[PDB]
Amino acid sequence: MTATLRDAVAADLRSITEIYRESVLNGVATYEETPPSEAEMALRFSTITGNGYPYVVALDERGAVIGYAYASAFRNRTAYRFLVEDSIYLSPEARGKGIGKALLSELVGRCTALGFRQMIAVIGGAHPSSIALHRALGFELQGLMKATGFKHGRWLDTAFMQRPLGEGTATKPTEGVYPDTLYRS
Amino acid sequence: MTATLRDAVAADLRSITEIYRESVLNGVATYEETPPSEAEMALRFSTITGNGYPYVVALDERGAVIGYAYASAFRNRTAYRFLVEDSIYLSPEARGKGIGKALLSELVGRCTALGFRQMIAVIGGAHPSSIALHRALGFELQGLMKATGFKHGRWLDTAFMQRPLGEGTATKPTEGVYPDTLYRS
Numbered sequence: 489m490t491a492t493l494r495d496a497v498a499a500d501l502r503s504i505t506e507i508y509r510e511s512v513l514n515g516v517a518t519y520e521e522t523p524p525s526e527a528e529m530a531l532r533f534s535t536i537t538g539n540g541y542p543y544v545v546a547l548d549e550r551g552a553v554i555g556y557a558y559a560s561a562f563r564n565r566t567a568y569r570f571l572v573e574d575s576i577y578l579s580p581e582a583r584g585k586g587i588g589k590a591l592l593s594e595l596v597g598r599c600t601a602l603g604f605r606q607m608i609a610v611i612g613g614a615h616p617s618s619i620a621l622h623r624a625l626g627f628e629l630q631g632l633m634k635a636t637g638f639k640h641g642r643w644l645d646t647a648f649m650q651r652p653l654g655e656g657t658a659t660k661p662t663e664g665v666y667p668d669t670l671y672r673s
Numbered sequence: 674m675t676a677t678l679r680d681a682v683a684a685d686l687r688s689i690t691e692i693y694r695e696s697v698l699n700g701v702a703t704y705e706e707t708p709p710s711e712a713e714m715a716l717r718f719s720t721i722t723g724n725g726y727p728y729v730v731a732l733d734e735r736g737a738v739i740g741y742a743y744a745s746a747f748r749n750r751t752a753y754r755f756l757v758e759d760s761i762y763l764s765p766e767a768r769g770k771g772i773g774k775a776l777l778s779e780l781v782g783r784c785t786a787l788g789f790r791q792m793i794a795v796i797g798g799a800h801p802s803s804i805a806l807h808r809a810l811g812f813e814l815q816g817l818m819k820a821t822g823f824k825h826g827r828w829l830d831t832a833f834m835q836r837p838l839g840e841g842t843a844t845k846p847t848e849g850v851y852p853d854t855l856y857r858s
Contacts, residue, residue: 518750520751567823567829568822606818633835634842638755644752648816672707
């Protein structure tokens, strides 16, 4: 079935926070240990969206948020301004329904339209299902940083994947229009 | 000769700031574009050293600072606490003299002694002499993130290298002692 996506709003933060909490506690996708409060998630949302990045939710048939995704900086240093990193979190019962693919497709398309040139995924635990999702969307595995995380009493590998966006490295970005305007001072 | 190294102090701030400034303006080792103020560099210094990470300077024959290096988090999320990232900056005059190797060796040694387990280098521009320096101290190239920076009018690659520290992945860390005590909330 076609996923139902829309941009996230403030009113989604409670559900976002719950989804992320489950991931923090039970998964390896995030290397955070203590679930952030809704207030903290809301600050993060404010910052990401204030920087012009897309932040979207997936909805079930009744309109409830069952997953979310956003792009943000890999690192917010000037020279990295044309690079984005994707983050995707599905509630357990939203998995296996093509919703990850839809969220990632949305991020890829949005960031293409906005003028970013490369997208990186930093995959906690190097989980094969997350690697495969990204591969499905045209990311290529760039490397595996072994034993870089420690969570749930285990050493974790961290996979790095990358996809070009739009013109990629082929052209110079247009001066003075977003996202060239990020991180300038 | 053998390099002269010591821990950085507040009195080294001007030299640190000026060395970094030159790197910001002229180089690809940092993807920052605008030189930070001394006050900003001070905040960074305090933060790094307040987390227990080593921050050292190299001196010339007059005792003046001619290079510096530090370790810090790759990302400050809990599960990354046993991972450090190295940063090394030499003034133009300190180059070609083995000082880079002394500084890197010092960071490796210190971080090993302190109980970190992995070190990553994120090498701006995939600069060949930086890659070579790191390879000589046992780092291995993990991946090349193509066209991830844009500086001086050109697309830059970013190389990721890694070296295990001490026991590496072979044992579990000791609970309750540094650096297990970092990023716990």
